[PDB]
Amino acid sequence: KQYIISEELISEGKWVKLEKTTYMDPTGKTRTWESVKRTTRKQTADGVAVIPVLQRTLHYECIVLVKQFRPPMGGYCIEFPAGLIDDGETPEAAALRELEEETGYKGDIAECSPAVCMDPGLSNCTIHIVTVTINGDDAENARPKPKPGDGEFVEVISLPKNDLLQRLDALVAEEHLTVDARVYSYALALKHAN
Amino acid sequence: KQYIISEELISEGKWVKLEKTTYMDPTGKTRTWESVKRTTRKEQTADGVAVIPVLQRTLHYECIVLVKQFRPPMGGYCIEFPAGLIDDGETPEAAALRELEEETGYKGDIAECSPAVCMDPGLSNCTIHIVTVTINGDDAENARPKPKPGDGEFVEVISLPKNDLLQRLDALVAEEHLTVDARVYSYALALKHA
Numbered sequence: 482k483q484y485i486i487s488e489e490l491i492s493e494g495k496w497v498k499l500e501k502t503t504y505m506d507p508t509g510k511t512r513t514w515e516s517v518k519r520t521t522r523k524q525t526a527d528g529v530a531v532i533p534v535l536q537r538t539l540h541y542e543c544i545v546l547v548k549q550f551r552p553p554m555g556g557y558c559i560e561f562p563a564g565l566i567d568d569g570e571t572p573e574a575a576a577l578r579e580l581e582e583e584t585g586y587k588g589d590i591a592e593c594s595p596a597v598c599m600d601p602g603l604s605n606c607t608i609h610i611v612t613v614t615i616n617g618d619d620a621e622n623a624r625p626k627p628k629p630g631d632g633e634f635v636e637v638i639s640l641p642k643n644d645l646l647q648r649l650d651a652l653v654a655e656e657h658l659t660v661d662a663r664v665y666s667y668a669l670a671l672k673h674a675n
Numbered sequence: 676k677q678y679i680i681s682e683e684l685i686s687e688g689k690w691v692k693l694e695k696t697t698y699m700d701p702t703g704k705t706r707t708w709e710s711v712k713r714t715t716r717k718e719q720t721a722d723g724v725a726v727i728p729v730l731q732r733t734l735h736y737e738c739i740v741l742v743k744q745f746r747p748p749m750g751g752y753c754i755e756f757p758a759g760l761i762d763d764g765e766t767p768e769a770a771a772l773r774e775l776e777e778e779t780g781y782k783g784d785i786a787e788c789s790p791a792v793c794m795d796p797g798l799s800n801c802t803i804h805i806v807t808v809t810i811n812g813d814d815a816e817n818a819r820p821k822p823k824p825g826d827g828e829f830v831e832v833i834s835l836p837k838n839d840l841l842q843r844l845d846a847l848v849a850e851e852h853l854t855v856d857a858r859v860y861s862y863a864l865a866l867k868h869a
């Protein structure tokens with residue numbers, strides 16, 4: 482019943498653009514919205530985010546997260562490992578690659594979501610969420626070697642799955658970091674289950 | 676180590692703006708980033724709230740109450756937690772309860788409120804509080820809930836059982852062109868993983 486009538490470019494950067502979207506509301510009235518899109522999409526989705534379940538015998542299962550300075554935020558953020566999908570890369574391949582580059586761990590694919598939206602009242606940005614298990618008892622994941630690109634700089638933070646929400650809340654209170662909404666949502670559900 | 680040096684306005688709409696961000700990398704090199712921000716953020720501790728609404732009823736499995744609406748940035752319909760921006764001077768909790776009632780008809784009770792969490796921190800500064808609310812669906816106020824949508828707003832409510840959320844979401848995605856929100860999908864994945 483609702484649909485897009487036209488999209489007008491307002492401003493195009495190298496990585497992001499702003500558009501004015503005209504759409505039909507279901508009463509038959511024409512309305513406008515300001516919409517953000519990336520200029521890099523090719524792809525099932527813009528990017529991947531990896532839920533990396535670090536499994537080590539006789540240890541708690543950990544979720545592997547990353548801490549980076551995020552210029553839009555003006556500060557450091559704790560997030561799932563993530564990045565944009567390379568033109569002609571599968572989501573699964575992007576997930577293992579990003580996980581390796583950002584954390585050093587080599588993982589196995591458990592499941593892959595359909596493309597899911599990041600902030601749909603603002604942007605068209607989408608990701609696949611890829612659940613990956615990491616056998617922490619293999620020699621390849623003993624001394625995990627991250628492969629950081631020229632200028633990126635990413636710290637790895639592993640937190641136990643069974644207390645995730647409490648551990649994140651602590652990092653926010655003590656370190657003045659911003660936790661990612663996806664990460665927080667995941668943590669909340671771990672507590673809310675059963 | 677890293678920090679913002681300057682933020683220059685590239686383009687400003689009514690609702691969203693694009694900025695060129697200059698920041699200091701940890702090697703001491705000056706770098707730039709294209710950053711999205713809303714124009715609506717004043718003294719709120721975040722831009723908005725998203726509500727995790729747990730519908731509780733005697734002799735029923737718990738449901739998660741979601742909303743479906745057309746999202747012009749996405750060019751289609753999305754399934755999301757109930758959500759809206761925080762009014763000036765409004766608390767996150769009040770915003771959460773108000774948006775839940777407006778979008779769903781339900782009158783909830785606060786359970787928890789997250790710190791401000793980031794929506795897409797490689798792209799935007801946008802942040803939300805995630806507010807967990809229980810809904811007593813045995814209360815007469817919550818028997819025949821009618822959405823009180825604003826002008827030009829059209830929201831559909833979809834209540835799914837918490838114990839089967841991810842499969843029910845997958846079944847909805849299999850049957851129509853619709854996109855699930857990444858926070859909803861993250862929450863459903865954790866409910867499975869727990």
Ligand SMILES: COC(=O)C1CCN(C(=O)NC(C)(C)C)CC1
Pocket residue numbers: 512513514515516602603690691825826827828
């Ligand atoms: C990025 O944000 C925008 O472009 C505005 C567009 C106007 N607006 C609405 O709520 N539109 C209704 C009231 C007709 C539903 C708020 C968001």
Ligand SMILES: COC(=O)C1CCN(C(=O)NC(C)(C)C)CC1
Pocket residue numbers: 496497630631632633706707708709710797798
């Ligand atoms: C909205 O996106 C942007 O503005 C670009 C800015 C450049 N860029 C980088 O990856 N920069 C590193 C390698 C220094 C980390 C991608 C993101």
Ligand SMILES: [Cl-]
Pocket residue numbers: 534591612868
């Ligand atoms: Cl798992």
Ligand SMILES: [Mg+2]
Pocket residue numbers: 562563564583
């Ligand atoms: Mg990344």
Ligand SMILES: [Mg+2]
Pocket residue numbers: 564582630
């Ligand atoms: Mg990368």
Ligand SMILES: [Mg+2]
Pocket residue numbers: 757758759774778
């Ligand atoms: Mg809303």
Ligand SMILES: [Mg+2]
Pocket residue numbers: 758759774777778
């Ligand atoms: Mg609303």
